């Protein structure tokens, strides 16, 4: 099974480790992002067939899909909370905390995806196969071998569908319902990327260099 496989490759629980203003909040998220960026990359290589792609294509996918995969981590962690965003198990933002630190509009955007996933009652197994699917479905304009990337997409999609066609056969077309959240996923990731590039430009906030490198690709 690819799901059991992709599942135990996921990192273990993350903990925030950060003048208590807006500039200290952004830094905590920016370094939580950079720390998980590092872990996506470790995790990506466990996706079957991902490492058999040419390195340029592995980078093209990651460069397109990285924020989508982070957002899906925040979403998964946030499912049990009452309109809270858990960037980490340590670090759980609400509306007022968000608004003060300038993150309100981003906060509302992610919460919309959170509330959609709460109603779908998405499981850890589905988050994992969906993270993988967002990676292979990134739509990078810089892929050299579209056919190999499509094969991966077909594989991850098969997995998601065959996982659903048994573990959750009580609910029909539950696969498609999860796929139908992907546009909002990409949309929300677009808002996060612009906001975080907006604090990149401002310069008042420091960013570990892997995070910065991903942000300028976008």
């Amino acid at each position: 099974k690819i799901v059991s496989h992709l599942l135990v490759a996921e990192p273990d629980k993350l903990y925030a480790m950060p003048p208590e203003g807006d500039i200290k909040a952004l830094t905590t998220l920016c370094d939580l992002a950079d720390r998980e960026l590092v872990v996506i990359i470790g995790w990506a290589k466990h996706i079957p067939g991902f490492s058999s792609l040419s390195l340029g294509d592995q980078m093209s996918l990651l460069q397109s899909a990285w924020m989508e995969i982070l957002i899906l981590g925040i979403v998964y962690r946030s499912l049990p909370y009452d309109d809270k965003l858990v960037y980490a198990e340590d670090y759980i933002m609400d509306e007022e905390h968000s608004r003060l630190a300038g993150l309100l509009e981003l906060y509302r955007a992610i919460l919309q995806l959170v509330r959609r996933y709460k109603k779908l009652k998405v499981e850890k197994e589905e988050f994992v196969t969906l993270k993988a699917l967002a990676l292979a479905n990134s739509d990078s304009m810089y892929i050299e071998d579209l056919e190999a990337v499509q094969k991966l997409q077909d594989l991850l999609h098969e997995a998601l569908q065959d996982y659903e066609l048994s573990q959750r056969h009580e609910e029909p077309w539950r696969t498609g319902k999860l796929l139908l959240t992907l546009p909002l996923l990409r949309q929300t990731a677009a808002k996060a990327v612009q906001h975080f590039y907006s604090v990149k430009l401002q310069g008042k906030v420091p960013m570990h260099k892997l995070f910065l490198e991903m942000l300028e690709a976008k």
Partner: peptide, 10 residues
């Protein structure tokens, strides 16, 4: 030269 390729081939 990129951090990404560093982390991708570690």
């Amino acid at each position: 030269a990129s951090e990404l390729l560093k982390y991708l081939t570690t």
